[PDB]
Structure formats: structure tokens, C-alpha cells
């Protein structure tokens, strides 16, 4: 139920996910974190997660998209 308030935490995950520190998560950046976190994902499996989060259709997950993906059911 607590999603909108997760901002405090969801915001911390960004800095950890964004290795480039540019403010944008790509398919290669996300998959990179999943590996270290302990999750194996293929180039296709990852790309499928990016599109679901990509609201602008640019191929990158931003802050507004990060919360949406987390607050998606």
C-alpha cells in the first residue's frame, strides 16, 4: 500500500542504480545492478522491463518512471 511515500526509499535506490550518476537508467545499467543484487536477466528480459517503465519512449527510466514502476500494482 505504501508506494507514494516510498519516495524516501525509492529515491535512494536511484543513486544506487544510476552508476553514471546522470539521472537515467538504461537497459545495460539496470541489468548490471540485477547481477550484483543476485538476479540473472537476459538482454531481452531486461529490455522488456525498460519499456514497461519507459513512459516517454526514449529507452531510459527516470524518477517519475521509477515511482510509477514501483507503484504499478
Amino acid at each position: 500500500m505504501k508506494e507514494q511515500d516510498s519516495e524516501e526509499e525509492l529515491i535512494e535506490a536511484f543513486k544506487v542504480f544510476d552508476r553514471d550518476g546522470n539521472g537515467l537508467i538504461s537497459a545495460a545499467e539496470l541489468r548490471h545492478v540485477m547481477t550484483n543484487l543476485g538476479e540473472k536477466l537476459t538482454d531481452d528480459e531486461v529490455d522488456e522491463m525498460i519499456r514497461e517503465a519507459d513512459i516517454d519512449g526514449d529507452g531510459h527510466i527516470n524518477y517519475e518512471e521509477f515511482v510509477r514502476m514501483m507503484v504499478s500494482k
Binding site: 526509499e9 535506490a13 545492478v33 543484487l37 543476485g38 522488456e48 522491463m49 514497461e52 514501483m70
Partner: peptide, 27 residues
Amino acid sequence: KRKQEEVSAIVIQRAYRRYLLKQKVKK
């Protein structure tokens, strides 16, 4: 094709859960 709209969400949700359980040492 099943899309995995729900399953895909768990893969990301679970991944974050571990990060919290690890970071959130509490004590």
C-alpha cells in the same frame, strides 16, 4: 507470448526487497 506484466514486476520488487533487508540492518 504472455508479456509477464505481473511477473516482471515481482522480479524488480523482490530485487528491491533484498536491498532493503540488507541495508536496513536496524540493529
